[PDB]
Symmetry: D2
Subunit: 243 residues, 4 copies
């Protein structure tokens, strides 16, 4: 019938918000998780209450077989895969001199290999449709760099190149590939001190933090027919922090 989506890391935070938003615009949504089965299942129902179809599917994005099993299963339930949103991601923060090998390895695994994994395994099916929209999550630090986050930054910049390169491969066959880059978004920011919040806000011309839903909005737009001539672009949603 209508059109359907997969969001990685959609059990909580921006992913949850993205998925809900795709439900509002009428996508059936698959809610990937790594370990939070119950919160996923909860979002699966929050999505149903929107009158569309949903289910949770567990899978570590760093592992290529689990990703293949996931795509196969979303195609099996839904009949198609119209929108892929690669949102799953971890930080393991340290100055370069204190960074352990497993803090590098793991971040790359999830944040960069994961996105490649998801992109690759979603491709036979999108080429079959001759249609599709892939949106990757990056971050303001992917553009400006940030001390203490070299691994994470490497992933986010790298994600942006993966976007351009994928965009280039699949363009002629109906598939757009894009990135969204959030600046400071309310999440944890909810037990930070006044001193620190104010330090953060002086970096943001709009003088406020961003919301879940600002990111969700930009993602949906990218997935919508109304954006099918946009490809290989990163949209920065950061209230002016980086221009």
């Amino acid at each position: 019938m209508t059109k359907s989506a997969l969001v990685t890391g959609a059990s909580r935070g921006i992913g949850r918000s993205i998925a809900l938003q795709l439900a509002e615009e009428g996508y059936n949504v698959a809610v990937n998780y790594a370990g939070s089965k119950e919160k996923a299942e909860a979002v699966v129902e929050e999505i149903k209450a929107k009158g569309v179809d949903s289910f949770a599917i567990q899978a570590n994005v760093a592992d290529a077989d689990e990703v293949k099993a996931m795509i196969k299963e979303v195609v099996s339930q839904f009949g198609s895969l119209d929108v892929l949103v690669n949102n799953a991601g971890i930080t393991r923060d340290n100055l370069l001199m204190r960074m352990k090998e497993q803090e590098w390895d793991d971040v790359i695994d999830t944040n960069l290999k994961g996105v490649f994994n998801c992109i690759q395994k979603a491709t036979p099916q999108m080429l079959r449709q001759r249609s599709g929209a892939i949106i990757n999550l990056s971050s303001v630090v992917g553009a400006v760099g940030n001390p203490g986050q070299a691994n994470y930054v490497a992933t986010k910049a790298g994600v942006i190149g993966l976007t351009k390169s994928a965009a280039r491969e699949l363009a002629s066959r109906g598939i757009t590939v894009n990135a969204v880059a959030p600046g400071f978004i309310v999440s944890d920011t909810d037990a930070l001190s006044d001193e620190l919040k104010e330090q953060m806000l002086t970096q943001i011309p709009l003088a406020r933090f961003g919301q879940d839903t600002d990111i969700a909005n930009t993602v949906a737009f990218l997935a919508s027919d109304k954006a099918k001539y946009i490809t290989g672009q990163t949209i920065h949603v950061n209230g002016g922090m980086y221009m």
Copy 2:
């Protein structure tokens, strides 16, 4: 009551299309023109048939008093100015060695000074509202440069800096300032030869030209509540030509 817009150079092409699109999303629209009174007046009615309010207003954007008179008049009719879209623009193409002084002067006047003119004169009113969205038209060549168009390119790049700088000034007061950059869009392209079209298409991974409405779509999105955390950004709508 509801919310209202001004589009410069909206008598034809992308401007026309933008304005219509703002009418669909329910803005009252003012249709600025420089000289094509009748085509403007026609678009004014195309807009009314959308159930919203409209009128034409003539004004050369390069002249600061005429721009002030225009803003004053849009505020007088509408009660507000919620969206300003600076679309008016001319080319005067020549290699640098053949470029006459009036070919430089004129392009700068319209394409760069004009946008400054429109931005400045729209500001007392947007600061009064403590709300607003300004969207500037640029172009793929603003990013990559292009032989034979040094004047035009200078304007389009410069427009992009004007966007960042304006974005920075007005951010704390509720106003977002952004740019859209079209690649190859169907317009004149309608009497070009096969040989040339194909030469143009091999530059575009999506392997087609863009439409009026792809630009309009991105502009409306930028003007909408759904984008109020986006500022000082240029969106490239170019089917992958530049990433």
Copy 3:
């Protein structure tokens, strides 16, 4: 046997670029708008380096005056190998406050100026089939800056012009590039400016000669495959 022309070479960054080009063996023509004395003083510092040098008065925003200037440089030196478009002004104001004259004047010197120089310098560089053109931009041309919508416009616009000229002139041996300095010491304007200092990872203001080093490098045989580029020289304040 090699020659350069630096616009606005009477003081500050141009003064320093002029000196480094001389330091490296260019005869250097020193352009100024009103600072006759100071420019001739720069001329003397250049002469003492062992190269040839003279002062030339021309308003860069005037094409006839630019043309006359180019012809006189070719006259004295026999060539024009390097053009450094450095002349630049600011008329800062909030958007609300910016006067037409403040916009007009800036766009004229900062952007029309560069166009004129590049244009009138082209035939000579085409006849040599070689040439280096270097344009001063600024960090604010990439990131924007409140108070400066006129200046920012011109500096971003100079980057677009650089690209377009690079592309037009590539195939006949000419490189067109830009340098975008960050917060440089020149223009010593005591205040709450260590706020700016916190924006610079290297934790100092750059110097004159830092920009002069990049400009000289871009002008040498060692950067002949680099064209259309903007080199940010800014201590890391913009990456």
Copy 4:
């Protein structure tokens, strides 16, 4: 009295960077993965320049091997003033076809490698309170490239790492920068490649030494205010 380490310095671009650093007075340590003979040959060409030099075998994707390598460079030269992260591989394939090993291997050498070198080289450069690190990226890191989603990922990722390390190490005198070469002659792989040539305004492929010139420049006292930057060396193919 000044010293450099170049990774992948046995042939191609590293070979040429190693030679230019020597040309300018650095003792140069030549790193290789398997090309012992060719690297020792490079060593000999460097020795004949009047500086000191030796070959050092280490897989950049291995942190222990990188650590050992750094310690041995410090051992022989008494310092590490310049690190040039050049070692790089490609395993090209369409997305549909790319094998896990092809992804893993590339991310490991191209991106994990750079991380390791920077990391293990840091203490030494911090104790000197001075230092230049230069990372090889590529034009395709900025613009993307079909067939190369693994390589592109690493080259864009190396630019992010460069920024982040620039920022972490700025305040103790160290510059971190990158060079992104375009289509360079090295790797002579007769075909329909003049298609690539039409993409280059300068209308020739760049050379080895063109990249070596930029790398040497970035490593010198004349670029000490430049950090976090990517310098595109590409004839204008990407501006």
